[PDB]
Design an enzyme around this catalytic site. Structure first.
Site, PDB file in Angstrom:
ATOM      1  CG  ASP B  93      -0.425  -0.079   2.483  1.00  0.00           C
ATOM      2  OD1 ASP B  93      -1.039  -0.683   3.389  1.00  0.00           O
ATOM      3  OD2 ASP B  93       0.653   0.515   2.666  1.00  0.00           O
ATOM      4  CB  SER B  94       0.253   4.615  -1.179  1.00  0.00           C
ATOM      5  OG  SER B  94      -0.773   5.181  -0.388  1.00  0.00           O
ATOM      6  N   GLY B  95       0.795   3.958   2.057  1.00  0.00           N
ATOM      7  CA  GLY B  95       1.009   4.626   3.318  1.00  0.00           C
ATOM      8  C   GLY B  95       0.075   5.785   3.561  1.00  0.00           C
ATOM      9  CG  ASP B 145      -4.926   6.588  -1.208  1.00  0.00           C
ATOM     10  OD1 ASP B 145      -3.962   6.285  -0.477  1.00  0.00           O
ATOM     11  OD2 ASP B 145      -6.066   6.103  -1.041  1.00  0.00           O
ATOM     12  CD  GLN B 192      -9.873   7.534  -1.968  1.00  0.00           C
ATOM     13  OE1 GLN B 192     -10.892   7.624  -1.275  1.00  0.00           O
ATOM     14  NE2 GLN B 192      -8.870   6.711  -1.666  1.00  0.00           N
ATOM     15  N   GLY B 219     -11.520   4.145  -0.084  1.00  0.00           N
ATOM     16  CA  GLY B 219     -12.477   4.864   0.729  1.00  0.00           C
ATOM     17  C   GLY B 219     -13.684   4.100   1.219  1.00  0.00           C
ATOM     18  CG  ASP B 269      -6.040  -5.374   1.628  1.00  0.00           C
ATOM     19  OD1 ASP B 269      -6.480  -4.573   0.777  1.00  0.00           O
ATOM     20  OD2 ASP B 269      -5.875  -5.064   2.834  1.00  0.00           O
ATOM     21  CB  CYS B 307     -11.448 -26.813   6.373  1.00  0.00           C
ATOM     22  SG  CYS B 307      -9.965 -25.807   6.126  1.00  0.00           S
ATOM     23  CB  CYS B 309      -6.372 -25.874   6.114  1.00  0.00           C
ATOM     24  SG  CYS B 309      -6.708 -25.871   7.872  1.00  0.00           S
ATOM     25  CB  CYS B 312      -9.297 -28.832   9.170  1.00  0.00           C
ATOM     26  SG  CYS B 312      -9.842 -27.202   9.767  1.00  0.00           S
ATOM     27  CG  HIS B 338      -9.111 -22.903   9.861  1.00  0.00           C
ATOM     28  ND1 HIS B 338      -9.672 -23.888   9.077  1.00  0.00           N
ATOM     29  CD2 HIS B 338     -10.100 -22.021  10.126  1.00  0.00           C
ATOM     30  CE1 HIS B 338     -10.947 -23.602   8.871  1.00  0.00           C
ATOM     31  NE2 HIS B 338     -11.226 -22.469   9.483  1.00  0.00           N
TER      32      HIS B 338
HETATM   33  N1  LIG Z   1     -11.356   0.430   5.324  1.00  0.00           N
HETATM   34  C1  LIG Z   1     -10.085   0.149   4.611  1.00  0.00           C
HETATM   35  C2  LIG Z   1      -9.879   1.244   3.537  1.00  0.00           C
HETATM   36  C3  LIG Z   1      -9.506   2.578   4.171  1.00  0.00           C
HETATM   37  C4  LIG Z   1      -9.186   3.649   3.123  1.00  0.00           C
HETATM   38  C5  LIG Z   1      -8.052   3.188   2.194  1.00  0.00           C
HETATM   39  C6  LIG Z   1      -7.727   4.222   1.117  1.00  0.00           C
HETATM   40  O1  LIG Z   1      -8.705   4.752   0.543  1.00  0.00           O
HETATM   41  O2  LIG Z   1      -6.522   4.478   0.874  1.00  0.00           O
HETATM   42  C7  LIG Z   1      -8.445   1.858   1.546  1.00  0.00           C
HETATM   43  C8  LIG Z   1      -8.758   0.807   2.608  1.00  0.00           C
HETATM   44 ZN   LIG Z   2      -8.973 -25.718   8.215  1.00  0.00          ZN
END
Ligand SMILES: NC[C@H]1CC[C@H](C(=O)O)CC1
Ligand SMILES: [Zn+2]
Ligand SMILES: NC[C@H]1CC[C@H](C(=O)O)CC1
Ligand SMILES: [Zn+2]
Lengths: 373, 373
Positions: B93-95, B145, B192, B219, B269, B307, B309, B312, B338
């Site tokens: 992710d971008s941070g 972003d 966004q 968002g 994710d 399952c 896995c 299990c 699991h």
């Molecule tokens: N509720 C997770 C969600 C929060 C905002 C984020 C973003 O817009 O950068 C994406 C993930």
């Molecule tokens: Zn399992």
């Protein structure tokens, strides 16, 4: 088809011995190190990983298991082996030490205590300890004992040891009364007597007169220091039957193990590799390291560059340093796997060197390097 | 020899798609679930275990990694893949979200913030975010972003989205300027506009005009609830280029995923399977269970009896119940393995059902059982 308990000595060097204990659930190579699996888990390791490090047997703590999840519950669920997924031998301690240390009214019958988890009241006695270990299904059962107080007067040490010996006889009888247990498990007795040679002799004599499958040296590593521990081992181990295994309980550091093997010990258990691993201490052939230390932040070498474990084939000191500092579970996993594997590799080098008649040289070379750091 | 980034759609059903993204470090099967590996670890799992569950790609958090161990340090040690022992694709992710959530002065240049670890001051901007992701060596880079505030006036949402779009263009340019990154990695842009259809359209238009390898719906899952999330997805996903992957960030529960796939999402994710696993929640085809609950204390069935896995196949609910209640690391390990495996099996059933033209029936059958509990 396999024997209940058969100890064979393949080779000796001085007081050191190497061999095998054959049991129904597998063979134990001696000298042996037993990872400690307190609450039905060797902390942070799947059983398959424990076995992959070379362990032949693990230890369970009766005191913890009788409180959580409970011995009757484990029995109802099929026994400890099935519950935790470890199908090889398990040794269970008797609980007699933890009730006194982790909890308390002591009498000739046993000890009544308050649980550390919730303050509920409980009882342990030779008979109840044996029954709990029966319900758990452990392969090596420890007689219920009392650690001789340290320091203490010779007279207090003597009265404590004598009670422990009466409890050993009660444990023997309770074990023998349960046919399934007597036919499938083994029973070890625990020598007491603190640092006093005459009390250690009386304890050994009493235990041999009762008769056990193996003999533990109890009451050590209780604050006396390595020099004194070795001094007590020097006279205490020769008092035990030579033809049965000798188990030093709750020991120890790599150098403790080497010196104890030189004095005739065949079996060990210790929380150090698991507990110190979680706390950031890794064992190496050049001594222990604290992986969180800043000097490892960019070190791309493995924990130990001669270690054969899976962790040292795949991950660097720098990565494990980061994980432990960040409080990551994977850090504990990797440190524990390496430390248990290191202990097993130490035991393998000990066994091979005794078998090959070069253990004295191994011990000297090990110490020179381990202490040079 | 392998492509940098090639997305192929093999089959559709309604708005749902299934296919593959081919990258230099491997193939990603879509719809895809990405385990979250915050601090250079998927918590409580070795990378080989992550792969064994079926994961094709994992997520790293730029905000956490830039603070500990640091992006330059990871680069000096060979990049994130080597550092953590995961050789397949990684999305970072971008941070831009965590600085605002886990930390703060925001301007057109970027955001300056105080670290949660120690209060040290730092800066993130489109250019710095891209450079950090370059130093980490991630395979899918997210444009820097700003999450549109929620709730907020349409005008505040609009100004936030417009800044995010200028930051997307700056991210594109910074990425394209680094030849090694442009030739070996992919860049995704983040739509966004909060819950406002006109702002989501303007955002999609801006992103398509810049041009990205993939398009995320940002968002969402910020407190609006599933009904509203699905309503926004209904109009937002069709605005994105159809021929590129669609990534819903930070989602979600199994039923969130199924409904989002029905609305055209290809990638997800979420921290839920790992974090809730450590806390004692296991996902099953009959809904989530809290394994610590007393009803599981003597349950010898596995977490889920269908399952596939490894957990299990080997351990019971009763054992895992005990481990989690005792605070044992192995409990977290088994629950996390699991849960990630369950998520991967869900994704496999989704992919197969779309490929086979029976996804609508799968979604109905899944919901009827999952919500019946
Ligand atoms: N509720 C997770 C969600 C929060 C905002 C984020 C973003 O817009 O950068 C994406 C993930
Ligand atoms: Zn399992
Ligand atoms: N220092 C560990 C040691 C404590 C006493 C115990 C016992 O004598 O039962 C054996 C292990
Ligand atoms: Zn190692």
């Amino acid at each position: 088809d396999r024997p209940r308990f058969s100890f064979s000595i393949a080779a000796r060097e001085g007081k050191a011995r190497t061999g095998t204990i054959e049991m129904k659930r597998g063979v134990i190579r001696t000298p042996a190190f037993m990872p400690v699996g307190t609450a039905a888990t060797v902390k942070a390791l799947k059983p398959e990983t424990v076995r992959a490090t070379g362990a032949d047997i693990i230890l369970g703590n009766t005191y913890h298991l009788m409180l959580r999840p409970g011995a009757e519950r484990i029995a109802k669920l099929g026994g400890l082996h099935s519950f935790m997924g470890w199908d090889r031998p398990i040794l269970t301690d008797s609980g007699g030490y933890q009730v006194m240390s982790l909890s308390t009214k002591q009498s000739e019958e046993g000890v009544t205590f308050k649980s550390h988890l919730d303050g509920s009241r409980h009882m342990l006695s030779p008979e109840r300890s044996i029954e709990i270990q029966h319900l758990l299904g452990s392969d090596i059962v420890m007689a219920f004992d009392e650690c001789t107080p340290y320091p203490a007067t010779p007279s207090r040490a003597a009265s404590s040891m004598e009670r422990s010996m009466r409890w050993a006889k009660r444990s023997r009888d309770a074990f023998d009364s349960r046919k399934e247990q007597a036919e499938n498990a083994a029973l070890f007795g625990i020598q007491q007597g603190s640092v006093f040679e005459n009390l250690r002799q009386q304890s050994a004599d009493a235990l041999a007169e009762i008769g056990f499958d193996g003999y533990a040296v109890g009451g050590l590593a209780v604050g006396e220091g390595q020099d004194e521990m070795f001094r007590v081992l020097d006279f205490s181990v020769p008092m035990l039957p030579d033809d049965k295994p000798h188990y030093l309980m709750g020991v120890g550091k790599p150098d403790d193990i080497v010196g104890a093997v030189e004095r005739g010990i065949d079996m060990f258990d210790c929380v150090l590799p698991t507990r110190s691993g979680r706390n950031g201490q890794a064992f190496t052939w050049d001594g222990p390291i604290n992986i969180r230390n800043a000097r490892f932040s960019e070190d791309l070498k493995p924990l130990d560059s001669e270690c054969h474990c899976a962790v040292c084939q795949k991950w660097s000191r720098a990565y494990i340093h980061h994980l432990i500092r960040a409080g990551e579970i994977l850090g504990a996993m990797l440190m524990t796997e390496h430390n248990i594997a290191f202990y097993q590799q130490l035991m393998q080098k000990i066994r091979d060197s005794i078998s090959e008649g070069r253990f004295s040289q191994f011990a000297q070379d090990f110490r020179a390097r381990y202490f040079a750091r």
